[PDB]
Design a protein around this motif. Structure first.
Motif, short mmCIF file in Angstrom:
data_model
loop_
_atom_site.label_atom_id
_atom_site.label_comp_id
_atom_site.label_asym_id
_atom_site.label_seq_id
_atom_site.Cartn_x
_atom_site.Cartn_y
_atom_site.Cartn_z
N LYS A 1 6.63 10.17 11.27
CA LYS A 1 5.64 9.13 11.46
C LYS A 1 5.07 8.73 10.10
CE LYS A 1 4.22 11.39 15.79
NZ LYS A 1 4.67 10.38 16.79
N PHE A 2 4.46 7.55 10.05
CA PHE A 2 3.77 7.11 8.85
C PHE A 2 2.47 6.42 9.23
CE2 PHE A 2 4.33 2.53 8.97
CZ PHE A 2 5.42 2.36 9.80
N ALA A 3 1.42 6.71 8.48
CA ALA A 3 0.09 6.18 8.74
C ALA A 3 -0.32 5.23 7.62
CB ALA A 3 -0.94 7.31 8.86
N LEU A 4 -1.28 4.36 7.93
CA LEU A 4 -1.80 3.44 6.93
C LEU A 4 -3.08 2.80 7.46
CD1 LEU A 4 -1.16 0.32 7.99
CD2 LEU A 4 1.17 1.00 7.38
N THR A 5 -3.89 2.30 6.53
CA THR A 5 -5.14 1.64 6.88
C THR A 5 -4.87 0.24 7.43
OG1 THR A 5 -6.39 2.88 5.22
CG2 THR A 5 -7.34 0.81 6.00
N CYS A 6 -5.75 -0.20 8.32
CA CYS A 6 -5.59 -1.49 8.96
C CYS A 6 -6.06 -2.62 8.05
CB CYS A 6 -6.38 -1.53 10.27
SG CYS A 6 -6.33 -3.13 11.12
N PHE A 7 -5.20 -3.62 7.87
CA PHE A 7 -5.54 -4.81 7.11
C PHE A 7 -4.39 -5.80 7.23
CE2 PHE A 7 -3.12 -2.15 4.39
CZ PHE A 7 -2.43 -2.96 3.51
N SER B 1 0.85 -1.18 0.00
CA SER B 1 0.00 0.00 0.00
C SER B 1 0.89 1.23 0.00
CB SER B 1 -0.93 0.01 1.22
OG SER B 1 -0.20 0.00 2.43
N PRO B 2 0.41 2.36 -0.51
CA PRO B 2 1.27 3.55 -0.57
C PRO B 2 1.72 4.00 0.81
CG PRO B 2 -1.02 4.12 -1.04
CD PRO B 2 -0.94 2.62 -1.04
N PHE B 3 2.88 4.65 0.84
CA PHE B 3 3.47 5.14 2.08
C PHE B 3 2.94 6.54 2.37
CE2 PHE B 3 6.93 7.27 4.41
CZ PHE B 3 7.03 6.43 5.50
#
Length: 66
Positions: free
Chosen positions: A38-44, A29-31
């Motif tokens: 910090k870095f965020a991302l969707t849960c999966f 998934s994109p960074f």
């Protein structure tokens, strides 16, 4: 090769600290970088990796739950 693990709720966002300043990221998934290193991302349920300058490969694995 330092491994990581964490459980998150499906859909909810997840913010995490960068294991190094720059490094090279590799995931399914994109960074999404944010301020304060910090870095965020969707849960999966997934796995990704960071290659840091110090020679330490930080592997990350998230487990999604409902």
């Amino acid at each position: 090769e330092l491994y990581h693990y964490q459980e998150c709720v499906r859909g909810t966002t997840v913010l995490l600290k960068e294991p190094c300043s720059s490094g090279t990221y590799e995931g399914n998934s994109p960074f999404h970088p944010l301020a304060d290193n910090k870095f965020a991302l969707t849960c999966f349920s997934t796995q990704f990796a960071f290659a840091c300058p110090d020679g330490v490969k930080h592997v990350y694995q998230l487990r999604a739950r409902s």
